Amino acid sequence: GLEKGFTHPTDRVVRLKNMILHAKPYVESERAVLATEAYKENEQLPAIMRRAKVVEKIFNELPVTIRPDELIVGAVTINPRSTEICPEFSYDWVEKEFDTMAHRVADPFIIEKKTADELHQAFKYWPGKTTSSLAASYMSEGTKESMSNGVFTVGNYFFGGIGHVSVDYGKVLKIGFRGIIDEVTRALENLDRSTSDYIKKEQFYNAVILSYQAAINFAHRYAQEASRLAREERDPTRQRELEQIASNCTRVPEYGATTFWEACQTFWFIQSMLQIESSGHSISPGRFDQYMYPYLAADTAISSEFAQELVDCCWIKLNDINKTRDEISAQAFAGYAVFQNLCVGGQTEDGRDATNPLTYMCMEATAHVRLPQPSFSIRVWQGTPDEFLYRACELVRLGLGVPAMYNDEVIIPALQNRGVSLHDARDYCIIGCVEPQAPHRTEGWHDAAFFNVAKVLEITLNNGRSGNKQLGPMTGEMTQYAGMDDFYAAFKKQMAHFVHQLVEACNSVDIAHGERCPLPFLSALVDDCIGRGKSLQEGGAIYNFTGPQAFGIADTGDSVYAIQKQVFEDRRLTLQELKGALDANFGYRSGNPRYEEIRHILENSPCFGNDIDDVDLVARQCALIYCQEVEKYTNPRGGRFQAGIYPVSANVLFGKDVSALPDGRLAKEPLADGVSPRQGKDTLGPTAAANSVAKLDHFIASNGTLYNQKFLPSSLAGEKGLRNFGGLVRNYFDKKGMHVQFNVIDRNTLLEAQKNPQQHQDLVVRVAGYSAQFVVLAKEVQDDIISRTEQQF
Amino acid sequence: LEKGFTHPTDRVVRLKNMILHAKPYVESERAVLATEAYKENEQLPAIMRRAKVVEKIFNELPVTIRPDELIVGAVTINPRSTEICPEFSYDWVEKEFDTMAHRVADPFIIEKKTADELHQAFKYWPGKTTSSLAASYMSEGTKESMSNGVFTVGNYFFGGIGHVSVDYGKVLKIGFRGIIDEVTRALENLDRSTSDYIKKEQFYNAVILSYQAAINFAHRYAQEASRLAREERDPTRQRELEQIASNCTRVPEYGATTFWEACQTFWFIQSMLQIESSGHSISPGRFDQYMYPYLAADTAISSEFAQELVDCCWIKLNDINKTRDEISAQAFAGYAVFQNLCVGGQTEDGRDATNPLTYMCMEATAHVRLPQPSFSIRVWQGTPDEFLYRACELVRLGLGVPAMYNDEVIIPALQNRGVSLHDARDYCIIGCVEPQAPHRTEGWHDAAFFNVAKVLEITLNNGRSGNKQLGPMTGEMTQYAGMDDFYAAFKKQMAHFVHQLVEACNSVDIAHGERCPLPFLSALVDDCIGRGKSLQEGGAIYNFTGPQAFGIADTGDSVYAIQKQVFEDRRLTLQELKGALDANFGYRSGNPRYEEIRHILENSPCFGNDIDDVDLVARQCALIYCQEVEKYTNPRGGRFQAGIYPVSANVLFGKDVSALPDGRLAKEPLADGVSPRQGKDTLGPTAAANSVAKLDHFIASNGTLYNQKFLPSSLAGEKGLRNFGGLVRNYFDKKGMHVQFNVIDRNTLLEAQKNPQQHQDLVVRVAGYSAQFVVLAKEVQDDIISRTEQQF
To answer: Do B136 and A195 touch (CB under 8 A)?
Structure first.
């Protein structure tokens, strides 16, 4: 039948998994100190070559750590699941939090006193030499003022690195780091030196070669440590394993991989070393089943058991990565999350189905390991085999939140509309949460900013004011609107004003990374950086984008529709009472009963998510106004802005920035997640809700849309549960929604994990486009997830 | 045709003598303030950091008005002294703390207090200079070639760029306030629909901040004038200081309303540019054109006072000084900053541009008689006879000035490089001999020195320099079947070393763009404001890079000596010549066949005697350099173009060249510019001029330099002047670009050598500029003494 169940992992895998779950996250100092010394030593160099010296010093000198039982080795931090510090982007919040980071609510980390003193010393170098400090210098005062008041934020790449990329893993698997050096050497040989342009290109080429020579050394340093351990090792079986690891790391990634186990080690070295060079998250394995499977197929000696165990170790290694952020940013990316998205299935470049045996081993690994990472995903298209969808649904039914599901049939045309070739778009993977790209061909900036559309609505209805600040243009007081035409004219003018500032802030950060932190190790693994002689930060990628995310879509749509119906059409209240009610927070604090009555009238208007065309098209319209403004703009890499709609863990945080709204929500309350209907307001079941969500224009939001559903576990039980569950996905994708993902959990389970967190350390559930340990999320985020609508067939 | 010259006021003489008697110091204030501004502004884009640098200096540098001055503004507290600009380079300053006061070329005093102050500021700079970044962009082969003396880019490597004539006329008319208004309007009109506006707006904000501080700087001189006036016991001087205070309140914040104000506008621009950056050759250019409207409109001023103000400007120009590292100072010797000022020529409509201020500028040179300005005249087909003959009277004073430039070569030469006919007609001279369309050009007119005679050395040694493989293996000279083989080999060596020359220049170019774009200077050249980009990033309408050839006559006479003595007349073999060159013609060994070979080579026909065969070899060797250079471009979207001029370095770089086939011994001086070799033009000045004009001057559009030296007897009287003007017209009609003249007796120079204390005021041409003879190193003095003395 359709239900096959899941196998169990080896005991070794269970021990490696538990080592992650029991690890206390620390902040560590060695990479930050080494990086700092590389900067001090190399003031005179062009940035790209300074950055080669940075990775050279780190790769040569960072501590090398092999953990008990690992088959796949490489550690960013001495301690499991800990974080380096990357002061080149920002530092001052680390020192401000030396004594509070261990106790903050979202993502605490231990900072021992010696580590604090070491970081204090290194940070003396940094004032005004970070990328952030330069980015801020480029921004206008109005742009900064809008961000200060919570219209939008570019914190992600302002305080940290970029990342958000799926590199050419298959190229390194084939030709190795030595092959990269060879390609660069040939580019040097063939350089046109007849003008001045060759000088900087040769700097880049030499920086890449130096970086990859050092990257070879790094792998050999792990081979050397594996051999030292083998010579002390007492169990002859573990000795043989350590000897094989030393052999693997001698071969890869310097040279192409010759076994599946070597291929896994090539993969993990690339995965970890990128996040050593830079703190940018969303380093996404992408189509792991596609580029890894030739190395499994050609390995005639490996058993299916050992091959699965290796994939399991990879899943577990992916959970060893961690990242601290400033105390507020950490609330927006909560759960010790670095968003390594790994997808399976879909189509080949020729448009044939891409399922292979490793596709299903990746699903098994998720069932074996059951940890937050990777952010595991499936691609779905019209020829997806029934067995692949049903197997994925059977995995979703375990309640980990994974796999998220992505619709080829929308994403491919969406990418084509942005200039991506049909051949490249067929090969897409997902970056981070929900963001599609042609892998190893894109500098996508897929989480460049968070933009609060509900805040823009607030400000529109207050004639451009926020508090006692004139923040936007004076588009008119809401009491002067003659009808919905007037509102929309004013909203578009506020949107144009604030989106222009959003683009300024993004491009300022973009310029700052180009001037100060171009990356010679990462850049060599993305087309066409080598061919062009330019880093990713300078536009070397074939495709260039910048992706800012809308917050409050359903909140804005339902509020605008409430004005349409309750004021203009049915005349239940006047524009003047609405203004007074909004200013008084519906009388939350004064107890005004007319405002409370008005709140009740507004709350009971039709809402997005019940398959009601009227109100659904207002949500579509409000989202379109944002998406249509964003796409008018370009970045300094010659690329195009494109909107996304996803919340990571910040729809609570950014709700705190918005006063009362015309749909009846009180000041500072949470916003809706992604394109999902407002929490608890879709009450006609999952098909009706999916039908509403699919009415939005997903194609124009080509940085990715995010739709969350949550099911009662018993509704998915049995073969008929899988049948219905698969039919729901096909329905939604046939109606041109881009993405959907599922929690499958009982309300009491979430409540119990709140009351007795020490017994629920392994409870992993979906937040938004990624999964996390429920108990490490702040209570207000836990409560928001609990408040989500419970679906049932 | 002889009027004589008037005498300056006693004030002008006192001011002039202050310059002669001044002992040059190194000073620390500007360097310390600059450093603090960098430290305080790490986070800014470079252009804004550079605005913060000039804002701190303009706000805080000591304000110094000197006794008797009518025109005020001091770069240094002490007269004739130098600031330090560590943003370009610093380590040689501190290396020389104890030796700079005693070095042979251009000593400066460094008091202990000053060295301590500089020692502390220098702690900031390791690896943060433009030079340290420029070196990092260069290939090892390029640095190796420079280490072995093939060429050097030291000028803009160790120091600022400069080499520009800014829009003085625009500031005279609209002031700094008008610059700010133009930028405010560019900001208003900015297209903000893409990402390109972000950096443009940084540039605009940097410019506005710079010019707000520039206005404060002039007001600070107004305050000090007003303070000095309050303390002045002499009533006449009191009124002068009050009038100075009023001038400095008006200009250059606003446009000038009197001639005395216009003179104060000019000098504020001239001095403040060289506070922002140590780049020299900040050239007033066509002073008589843009200043004359302000003289004509000034109905109240007397002729004598207008003359005395022009004299005060001449003397202020001599207040500027610049230290360089001990070796670089030998190449720019004489406390020299090369501020070239020309008069006459044509208007942009092709009519003669002489006006009454033209002749007052000539009188100022006769009044003042100091090294600066580097005074020049333009000469065209319609030059009035009275202007040429007055210029020749001034030349007879033996100061070396005016240098003479030929519109009829320079304008089509600039046209060949894309300059519009309208812009080319408005050309001035930069520095020594380098022409440009003023306030329209970022020309880099002295970006490098390139030793063509060294390339010849290396060619004949199959790419070797002292058993070091510096160039390609084009073949040993003993395998040349004829001159065709030599020229093939020489062109291959030239292409190799000019590619490295261009790399080194462009590396310095990139470094200045990345780390030191200039928001004060840039606003005064088209089209930086309209484009929203600095000069360092290509804001100028016209962009060039200009490297200078050395050893042209040496190379031509050597190459011809092989042609005649080896191939044609078979008087020695290639093997003997190779042996004689390696052995320095037996200078140590006493080998008599090598001495006989040297005599044979020394007596070959030589460039400079109107002999076509040898002259065309000099032409061909110079073309090979100029034709290679112009194949290349710079990062500002502009074009390389060769010049030929030595400043004071033809002795210095002769030390890098071993024996040559023309018979010169190892390490001996090279020839200056396009001039014939020292003492080798023996048939007189018309013959020598006829030879020089056979070179292709048009392709050497960064400027050529031709020195002549006359016995004063041969220019005496009315007959002397007619002969002298006829010589100039002969040479320019035959399409030479430039000529200038020493007019001095041999014994005068020799006496200055033995009794320098009684000849501190002796001023003579070095090359493209004049200097106090007693300040030049003995070997430079001897080289000038050895130049051919001409006679009609």
So the answer is: no
Token readout for A202 is 């040769």
Reported residue count of chain A is 793
Cβ contact B43–A137 (<8 Å): yes
Chain B residues close to A44, C-beta within 8 Å: 126-129, 132-133, 135-136
Cα–Cα distance, A767 to A783 (Å, whole number): 11
Amino acid at A344: V
Taking alpha carbons only, the member of A789, A790, A788, A758 closest to residue A774 is: A758
Residue B513 is assigned to a structural domain of this protein = no
In a domain, B50, yes or no: yes
Question: Are the C-beta atoms of residues B154 and B515 closer than 8 Å to each other?
Answer: no
Query: Nearest CB to B633: which of A195, A507, A633?
Result: A195
Question: Is B662 a domain residue?
Answer: no
Q: Report how this structure was experimentally obtained.
A: X-ray
Query: Which DSSP letter does residue B644 get?
Result: B
Nearest-neighbour CA in chain A from B213: distance (Å) = 20
B109: left (phi over 0), alpha (psi -120 to 50) or beta: beta
Which helix (H) or strand (E) is B741 found in, with range? strand B738-743
Residue B746 burial (CB count, 10 A): 11
Distance CA A470, CA A482 (A): 23
b/e per residue A328-351 (b: at least 16 CB within 10 A): ebbbbbbbbbbbbbbbbbbbeeee
Q: Which residue of A has its CA nearest to B127?
A: A44
Largest CA distance in chain A: 84
Q: If you count residue pairs, one on A and one on B, with CB atoms under 8 Å apart, how many are there? A: 83
Which helix (DSSP H) or strand (DSSP E) does residue A184 occupy?
helix A169-189
Report d(CA B157, CA B87) in Å as an integer.
11
Resolution in A: 1.9
Cross-chain residue pair B137–A44, CB shorter than 8 Å: no
- Relative to beta strand B434-436, strand B428-430 is antiparallel
**Domain with B28 in it:** 10-134
CB B345 within 8 A of CB B285: no
Best CA proximity match to A249, nearest among A69, A42, A64: A64
Q: How many CB atoms lie within 10 A of CB B481?
A: 9
Q: What residues of B act catalytically?
A: 432, 434
Residue A58 backbone phi and psi in degrees, to 5: -70, -50
Taking the CA of residue B44 and the nearest CA in chain A, the distance in Å comes to: 6
User: B212 lies in a domain?
Assistant: no
State which residue of chain B sits closest to A130, comparing Cα positions.
B43
CB B197 within 8 A of CB B468: no
In this structure, chain B runs to a length of: 792
Bridge pairing between strands A739-744 and A341-345: unpaired
Q: What are phi and psi of A748, to 5 degrees?
A: -60, -30
Beta bridge partners of B434: B430
Residues from chain A contacting residue B199 (CB–CB below 8 Å):
138, 511
Distance CA B362, CA A429 (A): 77
Name the DSSP letter for residue B151: E
Number of domains within chain B: 1
Residues of A assigned a catalytic role? 433, 435
Q: Strand, coil or helix: what is A353?
A: strand
Interface of A with B (CB under 8 A): 42-46, 49, 127-130, 133-134, 136-138, 140, 193-196, 199-200, 202-203, 500, 503-504, 507-508, 510-511, 515, 632-636
User: Which residue in chain A has the smallest CA separation from B502?
Assistant: A196
Residue A670, judged by CB atoms within 10 A of its CB (0-12, 13-18, 19+), counts as: buried
Pick B45's closest partner by Cβ from A137, A193, A203.
Answer: A137
Q: Which residue is associated with the tokens 């490297």?
A: B547
Tokens for A344?
A: 């399976």
- DSSP one-letter code for A563: I
Tell me the one-letter amino acid at A606.
Answer: P
Residues A549/A157, Cβ–Cβ less than 8 Å: no
